[PDB]
Copies of this chain bind each other. A is one copy, B any other.
Amino acid sequence: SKEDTEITIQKIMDAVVDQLLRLGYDKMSYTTLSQQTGVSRTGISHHFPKKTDFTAALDGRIFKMFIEHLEFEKGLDAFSQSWIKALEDSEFLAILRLLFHHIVTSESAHEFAANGIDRLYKMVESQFGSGGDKELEWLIGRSLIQMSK
């Protein structure tokens, strides 16, 4: 009697990922969820008692599709070039906005993001030696500025 429930939690998260991306956590409501998924409000309450509870269960997919946009195999410059280039892509922008929002507002700073950032350091550190952490940090600065527009 547990295969019936997970086939839904999954469908709730496949939606959570969509709305978080095109509406953002802020505008994504238990109602907009209830529409996208044919699941009743109290049916989503069941699995996710609080709204933070969404962002909580969120896992790999996001940061996996993030780093898609990005050049790790051609040295440090190539890679920033790739990231600034990447700043005019809406999905990319969205993905940042997302975790930028999350980091800024969420008390608990959920795992999806901790791993997220820490993964990128590991990558950048690994690929780009000791100049990486900073270059990366800066990229982040430049991005967050650009949203300030």
Contact = CB atoms under 8 A, between A and B. Distances in A.
A47 to B, nearest CB: 25
Interface of A: 26, 97, 100-101, 103-106, 109, 113-114, 117, 134, 136-142, 144-145, 147-149
Nearest to A97: B104
B105 A101 contact: yes
Dominant SS at the A interface?
helix
Contacts of A147: 103-104, 109
Contact of A113 (B103, B113, B117, B148): B148
A81 to B, nearest CB: 14
Q: Which among A103, A113, A149 has the highest number of chain B CB atoms within 10 Å?
A: A103
